[PDB]
Design a protein around this ligand. Structure first.
Ligand SMILES: CCNC(=O)c1ccc(Nc2cc(-c3c(F)cccc3Cl)nc3c2C(=O)N=C3)nc1
Length: 278
């Protein structure tokens, strides 16, 4: 379980999660070696939580935990996870014309992993394309559990103190700072919107929501976003997104949380929709 700093040579950075950098290391005990993703602390309370969460989770659509490397440089542990060089769907989809059936297999896979995460009484709180990694052409894994919390209750009371991804968030999260299982389903709807736009930047939630709100009064982007969503306005139907999928997307974006489907509801619908366009 314990990786040694001795045989752990840094190759490059992969990116920034919620607490500190994700980096590529070759772990070569032989000195002639397994390649691993290492998340590090640059906060200290939330970081300890990501370690304890991912150490509990085992699923084919959750990023593989490997171990903890006792990092003398930050007086803490680094999280060591499997390396997947294809990276995030936000990285991959803009440069690979993936067909509709494959995108729905990805969406089925996210729901299976999220169904598992809910079953273990955890919310994700940043289910976005940027946090879904591609292991291969037809397998995705959820990463970044930096904002994930244990539900005690049907929701966690979040704070304003935090790097909140407001463009992926349900009205109840934005207004009443309550995060329900049903709030992760709304985030899934936005993620599904990202998949069907091949995570095109010009088509992104922040781009499209600020296109509706504007930038003239930035101190109420949230208030304007909350009102826009309560008046029933939604991100548009992506080019070549089937009517049926957009309806499922809108069902995930139900203003009332109790009217959104659970992930266990979505799985057989996405299974069946996948089969059709295949
Ligand atoms: C710009 C090109 N992008 C890549 O070349 C690339 C390839 C693989 C990659 N892998 C990531 C990326 C993350 C990660 C991150 F760095 C920032 C935010 C969210 C996530 Cl899920 N986490 C893990 C991994 C990984 O292999 N194991 C864990 N990251 C980037």
């Amino acid at each position: 379980t314990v990786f040694h700093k001795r045989y752990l040579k840094k190759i490059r950075d992969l990116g920034e999660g919620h607490f500190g950098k994700v980096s590529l290391y070759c772990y070569d005990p032989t000195n002639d070696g397994e390649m691993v993703a290492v998340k590090a602390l640059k906060h200290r309370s939330g970081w300890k939580q990501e370690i304890d969460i991912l150490r509990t989770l085992y699923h084919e659509h959750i990023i593989k935990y490997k171990g903890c490397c006792e990092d003398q440089g930050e007086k803490s542990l680094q999280l060591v996870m499997e390396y997947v060089p294809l990276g995030s769907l936000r990285d991959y989809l803009p440069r690979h014309s993936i067909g509709l059936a494959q995108l729905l297999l990805f969406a089925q896979q996210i729901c299976e992993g999220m169904a598992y995460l809910h079953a273990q009484h955890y919310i994700h709180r940043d289910l976005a394309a940027r946090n879904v990694l591609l292991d291969n052409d037809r397998l995705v894994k959820i990463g970044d559990f930096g904002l994930a919390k244990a539900v005690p209750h049907e929701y966690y009371r979040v704070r304003e103190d935090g790097d909140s991804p407001v463009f992926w968030y349900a009205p109840e999260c934005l207004k009443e700072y309550k995060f329900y299982y049903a709030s992760d389903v709304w985030s899934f709807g936005v993620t599904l919107y990202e998949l069907l736009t091949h995570c095109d930047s010009s088509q992104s939630p922040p781009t499209k929501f600020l296109e509706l709100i504007g930038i003239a009064q930035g101190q109420m982007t949230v208030l304007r976003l909350t009102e826009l969503l309560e008046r029933g306005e939604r991100l548009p139907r992506p080019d070549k997104c089937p009517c049926e999928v957009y309806h499922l997307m809108k069902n995930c974006w139900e203003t009332e949380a109790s009217f959104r489907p659970t992930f266990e509801n979505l799985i057989p619908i996405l299974k069946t929709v996948h089969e059709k366009y295949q």
